[PDB]
Subunit: 245 residues, 4 copies
């Protein structure tokens, strides 16, 4: 109980899906949570958390724009005090085969997934290194080591891993940990359109024999955010039931 | 509080060092703990846990002998009920350069570190797969990807990683998780004789800038042992403050 | 001798350094080589190859612009016929600590190193998948798993690894291999420009005890480009004398 | 042509299968080859190489016994001069699920695959470090990161990777490289003996869409053995057409 009592956390992309489950678990452990998203459903997400007794706020933000990320952090800190935990979960897909991928679809995915994560990491780092404490948890993807149709997405999520590791080397001596999680196949409100035949193939690749839930990702986030995980830094942890993509 | 309430754990090699810190954290979270070791100080270790309010017992065992591992599990279960958590921490070093390593020093390290871990995993697996639940956590080493003077030790700990991954593939569908932890440079009661100059070199390789404590390893074990970590399987998690060996 | 006889290769970033050594080895093995670079010294590079008896041409190109990459490939094929081998070596650095990295310096490094590599891979893939044969060799970096001061560079080079792996999955069945090489510490004008203390530290991290040459990278490229390496696909091979960064 | 002219190689486990394909390619490149095996078909293997124009000799050896490995190296050097290249390919399987694996089947696989490889590496290292040159190439397996039914085999082959990396760290400064290859799914008499459903499943896991040949592994061995690969050390290279097990 209360591993993260009165810590302030920003979770990007947390209106739905994996990010909302992360937010739920952080709130369960006592964190005050900022849901940062472009999706207006973020307000309903924050309200759901509040209804359960947690303190939460939605801040509408496009993380690809530095000025908006700056404003996000300033507003978060005005509301809830210093940001102790940043979870970079925001990510989009615009899949296409390598020979067909448009420049626009390339650009959009790199801008959100990779640049947006950099911009948020940067705002956290500026603050956390001065304060001498912090947690940065990046949500990458099982696709970081390749997946058909995901030239842009795999580039973006592998790039997040590289930044995770660099950031660990720069920030560990300041009392900050920076780690990445790679979810496996997670069944959420954002995967309700996966065809049955495709689910069967996915499940066949999972030793556990079932698709995970958003809260499985959230439990790992909450551990990494805790004081107990002070000596885990620069790691890439799969939360996937053994699945190899 | 009490993430492992009602659970029973065997920790091998837990009389001192990293293993004892693992046992302390599991006990803190409510597990009943069997300290399995050849070291007679194991009794004092179990007594220390009892003095702190935990349920703990020492069982003298040489994990390289199958009959002793069988007896360990039968006695553990007679005392404390079904073993929910196995932590394979026992390991020894008999270091030598590749061109100098004696056959006896080879044989001893493989027998304890690799065969002993297999024998304990096997006794856990037989039980856990029938019961439909379990946790196996193997303590490997940063040396699994090579270290001067450690042909035998690196062989043994890399071999533990291979078995971890195999066991995940076999046991995940039965409700068991199998994961490995690689400690970095951890300062314990078993490293009090490391020379100052050698510590300085070690610390220079750690981004965090300090050597970890046995309880840092224990926190990660306790998370992996928890119900919250049900979807983490087959992983190798470094607990080393960013250190690359 | 002549493992790549009358194959056509484009090597990006080949005016100097690692890329020029790659070009030298490909030419030694009989490839006709396009040196593609922004650096005008590319002409002298091509002339050096020609003086040795090889067929080589310099094409001035900024690989961050899709139109220039399209023109590069069309010109290459008009001169030397179908492109059998693409080596993506072009890359820039604009290093800075995470808390100090300007948006322009982020943007520029991603645009050249990551987007530019994608655009070249895409032009190769369009052609090679129709022809039923090809080689794509991406030069990543030891920094892809982190390096102080290299948030942007490490992002870009880890992203190249993700794309390498994706491309293998899409193109292997078409007779194309896609692989990456991570040079270690290679003796070039750029590494000779680091401070003396940094040079000594780097040599102390290399088991071989010396900094490699550009031609060492070239030998690995030439093997992967050969018919003998038809079954090596999606790999990331370090050419670094054992160095772990 | 003739990348390994004047060199002498020992290939263990080279009577059949992957090891014989390795021997063929080394002989094609001009090496004198010792086939070291327990299998009496080793004589026919060496005769086939001789019939093709190569220098080759069969030496019967059980690599699990140190005295036999010592005799192997002494006899090899009496016949063909200093051993420049050691390829550790010998390995056996005694597969069984973790909960069923007998002690004898554990013991035998570790003794051959892991101890035997150590003993051979040790005899090579003693010699090569004094001479200031050498190549050690260990054949591991795709199973080193887990495979159902292969607790013992996966332990043994992961252990080989650990030793490879250790040996690189000790021997690189003496002019020796130590590397490992992990074959994928290679078409041999042994893989053709799997059940139909397993064959189909395996082909579906290979991006290249076909099972490789023993000579594909041999091509990678021959490159690593060459002077051109002097700066590749401590690597684990998959020869698998992109296959992830």
């Amino acid at each position: 109980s209360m591993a993260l009592a009165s810590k302030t956390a920003i979770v990007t992309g947390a209106a739905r899906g994996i990010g909302f489950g992360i937010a739920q678990v952080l709130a369960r452990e006592g964190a005050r949570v900022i849901i940062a998203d472009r999706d207006a459903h973020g307000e309903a997400a924050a309200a759901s958390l509040r209804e359960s007794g947690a303190q939460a706020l939605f801040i509408s933000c496009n993380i690809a724009e530095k000025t908006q990320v700056e404003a996000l952090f300033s507003q978060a800190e005005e509301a809830f005090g210093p940001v102790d935990i940043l979870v970079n979960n925001a990510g989009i897909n615009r899949d296409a085969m390598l020979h067909k991928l448009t420049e626009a679809d390339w650009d959009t995915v790199i801008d959100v997934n990779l640049k947006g994560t950099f911009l948020c990491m940067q705002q956290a780092a500026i603050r956390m290194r001065e304060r001498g404490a912090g947690r940065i948890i990046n949500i990458a993807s099982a696709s970081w080591l390749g997946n058909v149709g995901q030239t842009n997405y795999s580039a973006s999520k592998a790039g997040v891993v590289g930044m995770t590791k660099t950031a660990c080397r720069e920030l560990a001596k300041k009392g900050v940990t920076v780690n990445a999680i790679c979810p496996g196949f997670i069944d959420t409100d954002m995967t309700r359109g996966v065809p049955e035949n495709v689910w069967q193939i996915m499940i066949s690749k999972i030793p556990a024999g079932y698709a995970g839930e958003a809260k499985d990702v959230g439990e790992c986030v909450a551990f990494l955010a805790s004081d107990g995980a002070r000596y885990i830094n620069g790691e890439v942890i799969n939360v996937g039931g053994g699945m190899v993509l």
